[PDB]
Design a protein around this ligand. Structure first.
Ligand code: CLA
Ligand code: CLA
Ligand code: CLA
Ligand code: CLA
Ligand code: CLA
Ligand code: CLA
Ligand code: CLA
Ligand code: CLA
Ligand code: BCR
Ligand code: BCR
Ligand code: SF4
Ligand code: SF4
Lengths: 80, 163, 106, 141, 40, 64
């Protein structure tokens, strides 16, 4: 039940998508960049809060932010 | 005198502390022979101890009821009652040395940054340049006020802020 | 089973003494932060991370172990020497119970 | 993809003696995940929970309790052996859901069908202070 | 030799020479002139 | 030409940036209508280790 918002400064590196283990992020076409790509966060219900996505964004300041919030079974990474 | 402190010459506990510290060595000196090296070592320590006590008394120090010398910090009382060498004068002896270190390091930083690859110059120093600046810093207060009155000391809002 | 040796693999010179961080690919670039300094002294003796070759890791290890022996032997010789010139061994030998050892005069 | 592949719950599993990192009571009650892939030969691979196992030529199937345990295995197979796995989500009610290649193409490659979600059209920062939204939830949305 | 002098110009080697200077200077200034506290 | 010249130094004005009120070389500029075309390169690294970032026209100004 975490929140993931991507901002206007994305450049279509795809490094955020490759890093997330839980497949929260995917690439969508867009007209704002040279690469003509942008990220997205359709399924944040599966988000866990590892912040590997933030680690990979090479911008001056991040085009991706994970705002932590209410927890859940999927978010807490509980096998039980 | 001042602050209810006696001079160290007139104090009794000051001389009591001298007779004590010498008695320890005399007892320790009895064990060894006259012409041996342990005897010469202790006699020298005895000679130094006798010199430490008389020199502190000669210097117009102030000893308290415990018998130990006290220092005075206000330059007014220090100059009025002749206790300036204690604190007031060494204050200027340090600041001359401390500013020496700043004026030197500040110049090495500025000059290496005017060239290519200044990062290498920090881990691998230019020793000829460092010695040159280190022997040119005898008159750092002149250069500081020269650089302040000129305005090339401080930077002007070309620095990073956070908000 | 037999002996096997490779002749003159490495040249001996102070060229790499001037270039710290040569062992690692990341550190050979140079410092832009002070973190490069801590990583230098840390990753220095992690030979497994420098290179994948098991042979080079073996050459480095077998030769570094010779260093610890030399470091030990001057330490051990120091105790014998400091015990010879700056000690009371001959006096303690004649009256061991009452006399105490000493080898570090100040 | 062209069409979602439905689950074949009866396929051969790898040769694995067993371990203690398997499924717990949560799986039967809440949900569990299963992964499928197709190998060309018999190989050995590291399991996320436990040790090593031997794949089988043809389809293979595993059961896991977490999505990360499954995607951890996809990254191993896509890199080491260069395969194309696909995994689902199974609830206690028997319902099945097809998750990861939801469009058939992996997420790191674009596709025209996808639609953006949670896309702010502003720079990071450049957003209202919390005082403006003091009595309801959210400064970023 | 150019590389040897460069190694000697590194930070810790230059710091070692500094330390022997400042330390030996202070010690010998306390070997002679023993026990200063007041400056004349 | 839309923007600053190639190889020209410019000063940044993003408040968020590690390089704010700091100078960097212009690596390139795109003239296809992108929101953040101006590519800039600095010598000093940021906290992550990146020394480049695409800035906008309004966010950059002349040196010093
Ligand atoms: C048991 C101690 C020991 C031993 C055997 C080694 C062995 C080694 N270290 Mg290591 N190291 C040690 C302790 C030790 N280290 C410690 C405590 C640190 C600090 C964290 C380091 C930090 C370190 C770094 C950062 C690096 C090494 C490197 C090396 C290799 C370099 C060998 C070389 O150039 O020949 C040395 C040759 C000699 C002849 C030895 C004597 C040289 C003397 C000291 C003359 C120079 C002194 C100079 C004139 C100034 C002082 C004079 C006087 C006061 C002594 C080798 C595997 C380097 C490497 O490439 O490893 C992969 C490297 O980059 N080490
Ligand atoms: C993680 C923390 C960290 C670390 C590891 C460092 C590390 C370093 N900093 Mg640094 N710094 C830090 C945090 C840190 N800093 C912070 C938080 C700040 C505040 C912003 C600074 C601000 C700062 C400044 C402003 C400077 C450094 C400098 C340095 C370098 C010092 C090298 C040195 O002392 O020269 C070697 C040691 C000496 C004592 C030099 C002495 C030279 C004398 C004159 C030679 C004379 C002796 C002679 C040659 C030998 C004769 C011997 C004979 C008798 C036998 C070193 C790389 C300095 C630099 O750039 O390097 C030069 C510098 O100017 N730092
Ligand atoms: C915060 C620093 C500080 C403090 C707390 C004091 C405190 C004191 N100073 Mg002093 N002084 C200082 C700095 C300071 N000094 C400096 C920097 C100088 C210049 C070198 C002097 C020069 C000075 C003189 C010349 C005299 C004092 C005297 C005195 C004492 C009487 C009150 C007084 O100053 O007149 C009232 C001040 C009103 C503003 C008092 C103990 C007097 C003294 O000896 O007391 C018996 C005296 O004659 N001071
Ligand atoms: C009788 C033969 C013999 C002897 C005495 C040794 C002795 C030793 N070997 Mg060894 N070794 C041998 C055969 C031998 N080896 C064979 C046949 C192989 C290959 C199969 C190896 C491969 C081997 C490796 C890979 C390593 C050793 C190491 C060591 C040392 C361990 C350090 C220790 O425990 O402190 C005891 C220390 C001492 C007793 C100090 C004495 C030191 C002197 C110089 C050694 C003298 C013996 C020497 C081997 C004789 C031949 C040298 C001659 C050709 C010049 C020790 C000196 C380690 C090493 O090199 O550490 C430095 C190490 O890593 N050995
Ligand atoms: C584990 C190794 C080890 C350790 C920790 C020590 C520790 C010590 N040694 Mg020792 N020593 C060792 C090994 C060791 N030693 C070995 C292996 C030898 C001989 C092979 C010696 C020979 C030795 C002598 C002959 C003397 C010491 C002294 C000392 C003391 C240091 C003071 C000193 O030398 O000034 C440090 C001096 C320097 C750093 C300057 C460098 C030396 C220059 C080049 C010589 C200048 C002399 C000049 C020409 C006149 C200290 C207790 C001294 C001592 O205790 O005397 C009371 C002393 O006189 N050591
Ligand atoms: C032999 C083992 C050994 C040891 C103990 C050290 C220890 C150190 N190295 Mg190092 N180094 C080694 C081997 C070793 N190195 C080898 C083999 C190499 C490859 C040539 C290097 C290359 C290297 C580089 C390139 C640098 C160091 C630096 C440093 C210092 C870290 C900076 C710090 O904390 O001060 C922080 C200091 C300040 C913030 C202000 C300056 C004040 C300092 C402390 C005064 C000088 C200290 C003096 C060197 C101490 C005497 C030496 C001591 C080990 C006995 C630290 C003293 C860094 C440094 O600047 O050293 C000073 C640095 O940039 N090392
Ligand atoms: C700042 C550095 C410095 C300075 C100015 C001096 C100055 C002096 N030393 Mg000296 N010394 C130093 C460092 C220094 N030392 C160091 C680091 C060592 C290594 C232990 C020595 C070892 C040493 C010895 C062994 C002797 C001197 C002696 C002397 C004096 C006559 C030469 C002279 C006052 C001599 C002396 O006693 O003066 C008559 C003498 O015999 N020094
Ligand atoms: C705030 C820290 C501080 C301060 C202000 C002092 C101040 C002093 N100490 Mg002390 N000391 C300190 C920390 C400090 N110490 C620590 C941490 C230790 C333990 C390591 C000691 C251990 C110690 C001993 C064992 C001795 C001193 C001595 C001295 C005096 C020596 C003056 C001198 O070197 O001659 C003056 C030197 C110069 C004028 C030359 C420098 C100027 C250059 C050349 C320019 C002075 C009052 C000595 C003394 O006489 O005590 C009364 C002494 O015997 N101190
Ligand atoms: C005298 C005395 C005293 C008094 C004091 C006082 C009280 C004072 C005050 C003072 C103050 C109130 C002041 C403040 C201000 C400060 C400042 C402002 C400083 C300056 C600095 C600077 C600016 C810098 C420096 C430098 C460096 C860092 C490096 C480069 C160069 C130089 C060196 C310059 C007492 C009694 C205590 C003690 C004794 C003596
Ligand atoms: C011995 C002798 C002598 C002399 C010598 C000399 C060389 C002199 C001295 C020297 C000097 C020159 C000294 C100095 C001293 C110093 C001092 C005395 C210091 C102290 C310190 C202080 C003052 C501190 C304070 C403080 C505090 C407490 C807190 C706050 C901070 C401060 C830091 C400020 C002669 C010749 C007669 C000879 C015989 C013997
Ligand atoms: S990591 Fe950030 S900059 Fe890179 S493609 Fe994803 S959103 Fe854009
Ligand atoms: S924190 Fe982890 S799971 Fe959540 S969006 Fe970032 S990379 Fe994906």
């Amino acid at each position: 039940a975490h929140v993931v918002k991507i901002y206007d400064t994305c450049i279509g590196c795809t490094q955020c998508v490759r890093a997330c283990p839980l497949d929260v992020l995917e690439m969508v076409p867009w007209d704002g960049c040279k690469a003509a790509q942008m990220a997205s966060s359709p399924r944040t219900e599966d988000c866990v809060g590892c912040k590997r996505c933030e680690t990979a964004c090479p911008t001056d300041f991040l085009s991706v932010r994970v705002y932590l919030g209410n927890e859940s079974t999927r978010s807490l990474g509980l096998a039980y | 005198d001042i602050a209810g402190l006696t001079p160290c010459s007139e104090s009794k506990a000051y001389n009591k502390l001298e007779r004590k510290e010498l008695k320890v060595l005399d007892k320790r000196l009895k064990q060894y022979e006259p012409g041996s090296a342990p005897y010469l070592a202790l006699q020298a320590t005895k000679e130094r101890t006798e010199n430490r006590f008389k020199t502190y008394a000669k210097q117009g120090l102030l000893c308290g009821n415990d018998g130990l010398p006290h220092l005075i910090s206000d330059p007014g009382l220090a100059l009025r009652f002749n206790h300036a060498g204690e604190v007031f004068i060494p204050t200027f002896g340090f600041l001359y040395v401390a500013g020496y270190i700043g004026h030197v390091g500040r110049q090495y930083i500025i000059l290496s940054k005017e060239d290519a690859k200044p990062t290498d110059k920090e881990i691998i120093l230019d020793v000829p340049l460092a010695l040159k600046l280190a022997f040119q810093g005898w008159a750092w207060p002149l250069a500081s006020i020269q650089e302040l009155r000129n305005g090339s000391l401080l930077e002007k809002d070309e620095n990073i802020t956070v908000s | 089973v037999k002996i096997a040796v490779d002749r003159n693999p490495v040249e001996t010179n102070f060229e790499k003494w001037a270039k710290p961080g040569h062992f690692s690919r990341a550190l050979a670039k140079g410092p832009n932060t002070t973190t490069w300094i801590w990583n230098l002294h840390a990753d220095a003796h992690d030979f497994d991370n420098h290179t994948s070759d098991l042979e080079e890791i073996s050459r480095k290890v077998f030769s570094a172990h010779f260093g610890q022996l030399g470091i030990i032997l001057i330490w051990l010789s120091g105790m014998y020497f400091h015990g010879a010139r700056f000690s009371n061994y001959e006096g303690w030998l004649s009256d061991p119970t009452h006399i105490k050892p000493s080898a570090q005069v100040v | 993809p062209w069409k979602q592949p439905e689950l074949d719950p009866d396929t051969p599993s790898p040769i694995f003696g067993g371990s203690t990192g398997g499924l717990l009571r949560k799986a039967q009650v809440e949900e569990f995940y299963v992964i499928t892939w197709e190998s060309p030969k018999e190989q050995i691979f590291e399991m996320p929970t436990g040790g090593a196992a031997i794949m089988r030529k043809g389809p293979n199937l595993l059961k896991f309790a977490r999505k990360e345990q499954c995607m951890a295995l996809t990254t191993q197979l896509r890199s080491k052996f260069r395969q194309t796995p696909c995994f689902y989500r199974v609830y206690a009610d028997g319902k099945v859901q097809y998750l990861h290649p939801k469009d058939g193409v992996y997420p790191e490659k674009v596709n025209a069908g996808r639609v953006g979600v949670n896309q702010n059209m502003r720079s990071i920062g450049k957003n209202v202070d919390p005082i403006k939204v003091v009595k309801f939830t959210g400064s970023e949305p | 030799m150019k590389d040897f002098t460069t190694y000697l110009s590194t930070a810790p080697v230059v710091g070692l020479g500094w330390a022997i200077f400042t330390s030996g200077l202070l010690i010998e200034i306390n070997r002679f002139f023993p026990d200063p506290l007041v400056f004349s | 030409e839309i923007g600053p010249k190639r190889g020209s130094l410019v000063k940044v004005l993003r408040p968020e940036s590690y390089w704010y009120n700091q100078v960097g070389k212009v690596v390139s500029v795109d003239q296809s209508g992108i929101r953040y075309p101006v590519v800039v390169r600095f010598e000093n690294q940021n906290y992550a280790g990146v020394s480049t970032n695409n800035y906008a026209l309004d966010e950059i100004e002349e040196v010093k």
